[PDB]
Amino acid sequence: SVQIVY
Amino acid sequence: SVQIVY
Amino acid sequence: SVQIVY
Amino acid sequence: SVQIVY
Amino acid sequence: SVQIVY
Amino acid sequence: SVQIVY
Amino acid sequence: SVQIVY
Amino acid sequence: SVQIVY
Amino acid sequence: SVQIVY
Amino acid sequence: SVQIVY
Numbered sequence: 270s271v272q273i274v275y
Numbered sequence: 276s277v278q279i280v281y
Numbered sequence: 282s283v284q285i286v287y
Numbered sequence: 288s289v290q291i292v293y
Numbered sequence: 294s295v296q297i298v299y
Numbered sequence: 300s301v302q303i304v305y
Numbered sequence: 306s307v308q309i310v311y
Numbered sequence: 312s313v314q315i316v317y
Numbered sequence: 318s319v320q321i322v323y
Numbered sequence: 324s325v326q327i328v329y
Binding site: 300301302303304305 | 310311
Binding site: 294296298 | 300302304
């Protein structure tokens with residue numbers, strides 16, 4: 270997965 | 276999955 | 282899935 | 288699924 | 294499904 | 300899929 | 306699918 | 312998939 | 318996938 | 324995948 274959190 | 280949170 | 286939260 | 292929340 | 298919430 | 304938004 | 310919005 | 316947003 | 322955002 | 328954001 271690609272998991273991005275800002 | 277692609278999981279993005281702002 | 283693509284899961285996006287703003 | 289595509290799950291988007293604003 | 295496509296699930297979008299504003 | 301399940302989407303729950305508060 | 307299930308979508309619940311409050 | 313499951314998406315829960317508070 | 319699971320996405321939980323507070 | 325699991326993504327949890329506080």
